[PDB]
Amino acid sequence: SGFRKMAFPSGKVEGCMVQVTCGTTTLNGLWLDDVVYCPRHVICTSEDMLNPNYEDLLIRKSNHNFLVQAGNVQLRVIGHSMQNCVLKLKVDTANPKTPKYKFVRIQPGQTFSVLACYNGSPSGVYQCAMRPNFTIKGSFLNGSCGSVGFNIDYDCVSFCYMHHMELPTGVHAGTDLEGNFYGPFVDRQTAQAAGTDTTITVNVLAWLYAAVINGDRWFLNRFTTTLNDFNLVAMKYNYEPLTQDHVDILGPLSAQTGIAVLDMCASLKELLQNGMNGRTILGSALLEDEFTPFDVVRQCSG
Amino acid sequence: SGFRKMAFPSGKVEGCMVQVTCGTTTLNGLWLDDVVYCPRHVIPNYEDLLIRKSNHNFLVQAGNVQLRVIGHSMQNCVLKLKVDTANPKTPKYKFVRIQPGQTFSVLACYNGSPSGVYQCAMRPNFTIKGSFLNGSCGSVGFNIDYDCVSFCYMHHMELPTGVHAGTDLEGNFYGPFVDRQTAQAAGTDTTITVNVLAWLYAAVINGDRWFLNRFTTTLNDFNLVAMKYNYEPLTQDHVDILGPLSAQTGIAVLDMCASLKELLQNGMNGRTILGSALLEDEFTPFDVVRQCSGVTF
Ligand SMILES: O=C(Nc1cnccc1C1CC1)[C@@H]1CCNc2cc(Cl)c(Cl)cc21
Ligand SMILES: [Cl-]
Numbered sequence: 040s041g042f043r044k045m046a047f048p049s050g051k052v053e054g055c056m057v058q059v060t061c062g063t064t065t066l067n068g069l070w071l072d073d074v075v076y077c078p079r080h081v082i083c084t085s086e087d088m089l090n091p092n093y094e095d096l097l098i099r100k101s102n103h104n105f106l107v108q109a110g111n112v113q114l115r116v117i118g119h120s121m122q123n124c125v126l127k128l129k130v131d132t133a134n135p136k137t138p139k140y141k142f143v144r145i146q147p148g149q150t151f152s153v154l155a156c157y158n159g160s161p162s163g164v165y166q167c168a169m170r171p172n173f174t175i176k177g178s179f180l181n182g183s184c185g186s187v188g189f190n191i192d193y194d195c196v197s198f199c200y201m202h203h204m205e206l207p208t209g210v211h212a213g214t215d216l217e218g219n220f221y222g223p224f225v226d227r228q229t230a231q232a233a234g235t236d237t238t239i240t241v242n243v244l245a246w247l248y249a250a251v252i253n254g255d256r257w258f259l260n261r262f263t264t265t266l267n268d269f270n271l272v273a274m275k276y277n278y279e280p281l282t283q284d285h286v287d288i289l290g291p292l293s294a295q296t297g298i299a300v301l302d303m304c305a306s307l308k309e310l311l312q313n314g315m316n317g318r319t320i321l322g323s324a325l326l327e328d329e330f331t332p333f334d335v336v337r338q339c340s341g
Numbered sequence: 342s343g344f345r346k347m348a349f350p351s352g353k354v355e356g357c358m359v360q361v362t363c364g365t366t367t368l369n370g371l372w373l374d375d376v377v378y379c380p381r382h383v384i385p386n387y388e389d390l391l392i393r394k395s396n397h398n399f400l401v402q403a404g405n406v407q408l409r410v411i412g413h414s415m416q417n418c419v420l421k422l423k424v425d426t427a428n429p430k431t432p433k434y435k436f437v438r439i440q441p442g443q444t445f446s447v448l449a450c451y452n453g454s455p456s457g458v459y460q461c462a463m464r465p466n467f468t469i470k471g472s473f474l475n476g477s478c479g480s481v482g483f484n485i486d487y488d489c490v491s492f493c494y495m496h497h498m499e500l501p502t503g504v505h506a507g508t509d510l511e512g513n514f515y516g517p518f519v520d521r522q523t524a525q526a527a528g529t530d531t532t533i534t535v536n537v538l539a540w541l542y543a544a545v546i547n548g549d550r551w552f553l554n555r556f557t558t559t560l561n562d563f564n565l566v567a568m569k570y571n572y573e574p575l576t577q578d579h580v581d582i583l584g585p586l587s588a589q590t591g592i593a594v595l596d597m598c599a600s601l602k603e604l605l606q607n608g609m610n611g612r613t614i615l616g617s618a619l620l621e622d623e624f625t626p627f628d629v630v631r632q633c634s635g636v637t638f
Contacts, residue, residue, distance in 0.1 A: 040503030041472035045457035048448060050352030154350065160637030163347035164458055176616070178343035180635045209342035209547065253503065322470065324618035338472060341451070 042249050042321045044329065045338060046152035047191040049164040054136030057114065058159030059128070059185065060106040067156040067185030068107060068128070069198070069216070071137050075107055075114070075128040076216060077185045078203045079121055080226045088228035097121055108159055109134070123218025124226050125201065142216035143190075143197040147171045148239040148279070150331050151188040151199050155179060168242070168329040169200075171279050172234040173222025174210040177202070188213075206233050238278045239328040241285035244303050246327045248292035249335040250320045257318060259298065262305035269304040276311045288332045295340075344543050344615045346623065348446035348460040349485040350638055356430030359408065360453030361422070361479065362400040369450040369479030370401060370422070371492070371510070373431050377401055377408070377422040378510060379479045380497045381415050382520045391415055402453055403428075417512025418520050419495065436510035437484075437491040441465045442533040442573070444625050445482040445493050449473060462536065462623035463494075465573055466528040467516025468504040471496070482507070485638045500527050532572040533622040535579035538597050540621045542586035543629040544614045551612060553592065556599035563598040570605045582626045 059068040059077045062084070068077035080088070082096045100119065105128055107114040118129030145151065150168045154161050155178065167175050167188070179186065179202060188200030203213040203226055210233050212224040224231055247258065264272075270280045281304065289300045298306075307326075315324055330338075361370040361379045370379035383399075384390045394413070399422055401408040412423030439445060444462045448455050449472065461469045461482060473480065473496060482494025496507045497520050504527050506518040518525055541552065564574050575598070583594045592600075601620075609618055624632075 040499055041470060041505070043459040043470075043472035044346060045449070045459045045472060046348060048351045048355050048455040048458050050350075050355035050455075053350050053352040155347070155635075157635045157637050161350040161352075162635055162637040163345075163632065164350055165345040165347045167345065176343060176345075178345040178347065178632060180633075182635065205342060211343070319619070325613070325616075338457070341474065 040253055042253055042338065044166045046164045046166040047189065049152065049154045049161065051138040051191065051196050052154045052187060052189055053161045054138070055134060056154070056156050056159050056161055058108040060108070061100070061104060065158060066182065067159055069185070069187055069201070070107075070109060070114075070130070070134045071140060073130050073133045075116075075130055076201065077126050077128070078201065078214075078226065079124050079126040079218070080184070080203065081126060090227065090229075093121060097126075121218075124203065124214050124220060125216065125218030138196045139194050140196040140198060143199050144215040144217070144219065145169050145199045145221075147173060148242055148331065149199070150329055150334055151190050153177055153188045153200070153202075154186060155183055156186045157182040166329065168239065168331075169221060170210070171237045171239060173224070174206060174212055174233045174236070175200070177211045179205060179211055187216075206231065208233055235277070238276070238326065240273055240278045240281045240307075241288060242328040242331055243278070243326045244281075244285075244289055244300070244307060245292065245332040245335045246321065246330045247303055247306060248289070248296055248298070248332075249330065249339050251296045251298060252335075252339045253321065255320055258310055258320060259302075259306050260309050262309070263299065263302050264305045264308060266301065266304075269301070269308060272308050273311065278311075291336060292332060342547055344547055344632065346460045347628075347632055348458045349483065351446065351448045351455065351458045353432040353485070353490050354448045354481060354483055355455045356432070357428060358448070358450050358453050358455055360402040362402070363394070363398060367452060368476065369453055371479070371481055371495070372403060372408075372424070372428045373434060375424050375427045377410075377424055378495065379420050379422070380495065380508075380520065381418050381420040381512070382478070382497065383420060385521055387415060391420075404453075415512075418497065418508050418514060419510065419512035433489045435489060435491045437493050438509040438511070438513065439463050439493045439515075441467060442536060442625065443493075444623055444628055445484050447471060447480060447482045447494070447496075449477055450480045451476040460623065462533060463515060464504075465531040465533065467518070468500060468506055468527045468530070469494070471505040473499060473505055481510075488638065500525060502527055529571070532570070532620065534567055534572045534575045534601075535582065536622040536625055537572070537601060537620045538575075538579075538583055538594065539586065539626040539629045540615065540624045541597055541600060542583070542590055542592070542626075543624065543633060545590045545592060546629075546633050547615065549614055552600050552604055552614060554600055554603060556603075557593060557596045558599045558602060560595065563595065563602060566602045566605060572605070585630060586626060
């Protein structure tokens with residue numbers, strides 16, 4: 040029993056964190072085999088951030104301009120290339136702590152663990168989700184750039200996020216490990232703003248099924264709904280549309296609890312209308328949307 | 342910006358998790374130097390049950406390597422299995438006993454394999470609101486101080502309300518619990534007041550000020566309100582501990598107490614603080630300072 044926001048054990052990722060210094064800028068890098076991945080904005084000045092020509096700034100750099108530090112050991116940069124918004128620094132030593140890994144691009148609603156780092160030193164690990172507006176509600180301070188998001192399935196680390204910047208509302212934007220930003224964001228200090236955020240409906244439903252699995256049924260009702268009527272109501276509460284794919288994804292949880300997806304959808308509709316009336320669901324007074332159907336199955340069953 | 346429930350990086354602890362099998366029971370063990378620590382319920386008269394077991398009855402597995410047990414002894418509710426091999430991944434460590442209200446990270450394990458890490462608080466009723474399934478026994482709670490891991494908890498059991506009970510690494514249970522199959526219930530829980538205040542300071546640091554007011558209160562008047570809402574009494578030590586956060590934000594500790602008192606009597610009124618509709622009590626003043634300053638390990 041119990042339901043917590045749980046992160047993956049960070050050990051496999053800790054052994055990959057290095058410090059990358061270029062001029063006055065110091066941030067984090069991810070050392071996998073003989074490559075160090077980091078945000079390309081490490082080559083920028085604060086005077087360059089508005090309209091940086093990264094290709095122009097990078098061509099003026101040599102290997103010895105990039106100082107890479109793995110613990111108390113300075114790694115030697117022997118090559119450098121840019122792939123989208125990530126800088127790839129070829130180093131003369133392969134990381135002996137390199138785990139089995141993959142670079143995966145995630146979709147909004149997906150969750151991952153973040154190993155927050157400063158100066159190539161890990162300071163904390165937390166769980167979060169890619170918001171529908173492609174931002175993440177993280178906890179980052181200056182120097183956290185290059186901190187990574189990941190999932191660990193079996194013994195393989197799937198890297199899905201690299202932190203690049205904080206938007207004016209305090210939310211964060213970053214890229215996949217191939218340098219492609221999530222969302223309409225650019226690594227420029229130009230006025231950008233996160234789009235209106237929405238609630239991850241399939242995740243709230245997954246979390247309601249987790250609550251049923253842990254013995255909480257107070258919110259269930261005798262009603263059902265069509266998928267369309269649910270979407271018409273839920274869009275009025277800034278909830279993401281629920282697709283037939285989401286209904287299918289919820290199938291195992293529906294089978295385990297005996298509550299049809301559209302029946303759980305009617306309970307959600309009622310919860311949005313009534314609120315909780317001083318009650319909680321899994322220790323929360325708000326509808327939690329940062330647990331996927333996969334996270335619920337993993338934590339509540341194995 | 343941002344405020345998350347954040348755990349310590351678990352790497353130093355992951356390199357210590359082993360699987361311990363005794364008969365039909367399999368649980369987790371903590372391998373430090375040449376000793377494996379695990380709950381003594383893996384084997385009730387525990388002296389009588391232990392005397393009947395030999396070293397080869399305990400199967401200890403570190404990854405795909407079987408460790409050989411060369412000795413065994415019991416210290417309170419923890420079993421100490423002397424093994425032939427010292428853990429090369431042994432970090433700098435200490436065994437510390439924590440007080441209620443203190444927080445720690447839990448590395449949840451099944452079959453000696455870490456599956457997740459989460460941040461917990463030792464409740465005033467000595468239980469933890471953890472997330473554990475069968476096989477999680479022997480999972481450990483820890484804090485990191487620079488490069489030193491301070492082990493503070495070992496999981497032993499789940500109480501009927503779904504909350505968890507365990508010991509420090511010397512086998513002393515937190516709370517009035519015993520490691521036997523009998524009727525055990527967690528006492529009435531209370532809210533960790535100093536932690537709620539620390540979390541209100543974290544909210545101010547992140548730009549949430551709606552709950553602030555011009556008022557202040559005495560420590561006695563606040564403690565009369567704290568008792569009414571099942572909140573732990575706030576001591577002068579708690580006020581002192583909150584000093585740095587009071588200096589940083591410009592809001593005196595008793596000034597924040599009047600904010601808390603008004604939140605307890607009036608509620609949030611449809612509003613949230615740090616994305617929460619409830620007053621959060623599982624961040625200590627130190628956790629707030631560490632997360633709102635970026636300390637590394
Ligand atoms: O955002 C940034 N850092 C950061 C990350 N996460 C959290 C807080 C921070 C610092 C605000 C405290 C950095 C530096 C500041 N400006 C900036 C601008 C651009 Cl275009 C890019 Cl790509 C990176 C940055
Ligand atoms: Cl995905």
